[PDB]
Amino acid sequence: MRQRHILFANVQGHGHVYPSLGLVSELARRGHRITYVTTPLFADEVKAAGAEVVLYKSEFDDAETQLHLVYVRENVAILRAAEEALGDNPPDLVVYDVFPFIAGRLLAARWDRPAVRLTGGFAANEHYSLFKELWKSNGQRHPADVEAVHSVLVDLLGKYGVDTPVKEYWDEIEGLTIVFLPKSFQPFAETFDERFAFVGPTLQPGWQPPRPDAPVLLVSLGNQFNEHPEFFRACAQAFADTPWHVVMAIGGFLDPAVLGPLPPNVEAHQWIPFHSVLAHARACLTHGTTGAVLEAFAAGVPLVLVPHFATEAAPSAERVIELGLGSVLRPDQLEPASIREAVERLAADSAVRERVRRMQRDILSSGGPARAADEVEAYLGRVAP
Amino acid sequence: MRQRHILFANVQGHGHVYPSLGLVSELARRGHRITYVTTPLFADEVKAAGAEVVLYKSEFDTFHVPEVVKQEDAETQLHLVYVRENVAILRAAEEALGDNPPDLVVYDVFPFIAGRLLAARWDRPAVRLTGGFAANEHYSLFKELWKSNGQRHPADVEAVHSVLVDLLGKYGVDTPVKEYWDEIEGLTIVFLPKSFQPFAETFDERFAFVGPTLTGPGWQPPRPDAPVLLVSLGNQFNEHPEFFRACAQAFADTPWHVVMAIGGFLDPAVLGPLPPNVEAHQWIPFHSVLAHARACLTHGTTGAVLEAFAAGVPLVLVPHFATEAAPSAERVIELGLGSVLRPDQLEPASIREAVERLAADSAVRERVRRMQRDILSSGGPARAADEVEAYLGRVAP
Numbered sequence A: 001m002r003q004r005h006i007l008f009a010n011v012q013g014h015g016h017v018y019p020s021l022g023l024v025s026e027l028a029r030r031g032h033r034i035t036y037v038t039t040p041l042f043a044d045e046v047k048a049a050g051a052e053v054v055l056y057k058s059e060f061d062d063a064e065t066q067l068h069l070v071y072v073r074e075n076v077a078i079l080r081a082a083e084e085a086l087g088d089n090p091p092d093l094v095v096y097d098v099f100p101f102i103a104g105r106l107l108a109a110r111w112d113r114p115a116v117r118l119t120g121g122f123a124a125n126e127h128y129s130l131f132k133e134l135w136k137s138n139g140q141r142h143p144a145d146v147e148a149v150h151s152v153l154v155d156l157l158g159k160y161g162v163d164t165p166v167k168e169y170w171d172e173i174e175g176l177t178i179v180f181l182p183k184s185f186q187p188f189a190e191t192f193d194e195r196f197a198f199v200g201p202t203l204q205p206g207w208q209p210p211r212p213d214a215p216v217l218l219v220s221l222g223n224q225f226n227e228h229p230e231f232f233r234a235c236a237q238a239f240a241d242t243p244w245h246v247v248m249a250i251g252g253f254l255d256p257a258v259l260g261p262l263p264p265n266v267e268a269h270q271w272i273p274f275h276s277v278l279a280h281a282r283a284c285l286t287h288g289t290t291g292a293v294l295e296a297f298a299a300g301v302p303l304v305l306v307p308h309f310a311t312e313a314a315p316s317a318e319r320v321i322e323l324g325l326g327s328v329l330r331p332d333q334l335e336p337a338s339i340r341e342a343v344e345r346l347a348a349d350s351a352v353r354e355r356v357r358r359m360q361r362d363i364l365s366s367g368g369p370a371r372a373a374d375e376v377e378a379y380l381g382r383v384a385p
Numbered sequence B: 001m002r003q004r005h006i007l008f009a010n011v012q013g014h015g016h017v018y019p020s021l022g023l024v025s026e027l028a029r030r031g032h033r034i035t036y037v038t039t040p041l042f043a044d045e046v047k048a049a050g051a052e053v054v055l056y057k058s059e060f061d062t063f064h065v066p067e068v069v070k071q072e073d074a075e076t077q078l079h080l081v082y083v084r085e086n087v088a089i090l091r092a093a094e095e096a097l098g099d100n101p102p103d104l105v106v107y108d109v110f111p112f113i114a115g116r117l118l119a120a121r122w123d124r125p126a127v128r129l130t131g132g133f134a135a136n137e138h139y140s141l142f143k144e145l146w147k148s149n150g151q152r153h154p155a156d157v158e159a160v161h162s163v164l165v166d167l168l169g170k171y172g173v174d175t176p177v178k179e180y181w182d183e184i185e186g187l188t189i190v191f192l193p194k195s196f197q198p199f200a201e202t203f204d205e206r207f208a209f210v211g212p213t214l215t216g217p218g219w220q221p222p223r224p225d226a227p228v229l230l231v232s233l234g235n236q237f238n239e240h241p242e243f244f245r246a247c248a249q250a251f252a253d254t255p256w257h258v259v260m261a262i263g264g265f266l267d268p269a270v271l272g273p274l275p276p277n278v279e280a281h282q283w284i285p286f287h288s289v290l291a292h293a294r295a296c297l298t299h300g301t302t303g304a305v306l307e308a309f310a311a312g313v314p315l316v317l318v319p320h321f322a323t324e325a326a327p328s329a330e331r332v333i334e335l336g337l338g339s340v341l342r343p344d345q346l347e348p349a350s351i352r353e354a355v356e357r358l359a360a361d362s363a364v365r366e367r368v369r370r371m372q373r374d375i376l377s378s379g380g381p382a383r384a385a386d387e388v389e390a391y392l393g394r395v396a397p
Ligand SMILES: [Ca+2]
Pocket: A040, A041, A042, A043, A044, A045, B220, B221
């Protein structure tokens, strides 16, 4: 009955953009006007999803204070991009990813508009915060307790008539937070109140196994920038002369020729349709970021993780192990025979398999992009009648 | 809505199964028990979508080699295999569900005889699905095809008619065969945007035009403003390496960057050395490439067409590569959303000039952008699930 003008505040990067786009499309499907702040790198992708784009220039084009400060400057960059573009015509709603939460909430404070937080990672409240656990494990102070960071945030927050102490503002919970995870994957899930919606992951003729009885393995380390020909060769060697059929997605940087001849039961591709392979897979060998792990569990496929290939993968990998949904290979266990052994043990573990099938069920019932849009619209109902 | 037991009856084949799958998942998300009739070839895909599988044995396992080179009555044989395939699905579903029928039968248009007979015998409401044009008293793609082929309606062929009268009678149906064939379902979910439908204005509220299930490690172009062409002929069982080589030749030493998706049956090594601005892959993520593309050169199946238009990319069509592509291809040309190349028009220079002309055509550009908006506003699986749940509310709450 109402068209809403909805502004997305998001940082550039595959991991931050991709999970959001299903929601952007479902809201545009519903007749809402989507504006989305991003860089030229993701502009075309965001427009294809149905949104109008506001371009910002990314900063990513004492080491931790510098990581902290640039983080602040990136929020400032997105903040100023959105203000200049929208100007004397505020949107109805600000939806922002956790990374630019400074930008998002300040836009909402400056326009007097409600906001929604988006997260493709674990939710935070007073009982669990992944960010607090990370700072702790690295012996870092909370950024708010860092003078140089604290100083800039005081200035920034004052400009926007915010007098809230920096550490508290930092820890405030949004009116609504859409969490793109199934609830059972969330640490301390039971403590998370009504303002948190665990909606799960957003998600060519496809690939078909050449031999219908063959156990299928998917190997992927994402679309890496740095190249691991050695690992893919070791995987090829590991499953040569076994009943397995192995599909290796090597990304857009590595030339499949580089891997040399492959046996007939191993295939390598820069790009593969992941879900079509996972639908047939008995296991998946992967880096273990949140995205990768949930795609596998959405298809009921147990995991062997190699989290040293992905820096973000640590918390997600840790959770997989914690829940008994997969195993992990250390960098000293990457000889072909070791890879084989780990994959076979995991694939044969019927306890892990049943846990993963229950996770598949929890993903399915989570609700997806349609529910995430229903949540957005419902929220707008409450704070904007 | 309370959990319902919903049965999907579908034929095997990517073009029939894939568009249905978004709806399957969205219904399963809502708590519904989904059972889905298919073959082993698609059993994994359907299970991953959230359905339990009832297997059937396809006539097309062994009707591969009987009809390739025709003797006289090949036309009649084609109709008879269609009927047998409907019967294969009907028998499998009845055997599997036995004395415990589902609450609702959702059938694809190809097995409509199976779907409607299951619904009659079980005394249940039914929903029709189609990935192609809807039919009513004003328009029927099949009637136009038979007409253009100079062949009789299958109901007017003696061998087919006799089988069908007998089968219908076994389900307490004495409706004349041709009349029955044309009856309109209580609800039809059409996976097309309404504007793409011929005689769209004549379709009443029993037809929901929900559009294609939408698309979306991302591929990036080599320069920000590189003109990008996507070339795809689908997952061709046939080797057309010459065409891909011709495409590569066409754009060598031009600023274009060409991405060729050659499918899972062709080794890209077969193509030989490619120019540095041309890349070939068995699989590519179509959406990532289309988001940057200025044009798409494609066979013109309804699936591939709507994918291109979802991204606002105009098409150059080569429909002779896919017999299934003629209706969609003709619609694209009729609407001015693309051009077409014939078999004699496939020399490299012909390909390059055709693509350049199409990509520069502002009028096409604008009509395609209107089609993109239609598709984006069509509603998709969430709307399709809403329509199914609402229909249940009315006819079997
Ligand atoms: Ca891009």
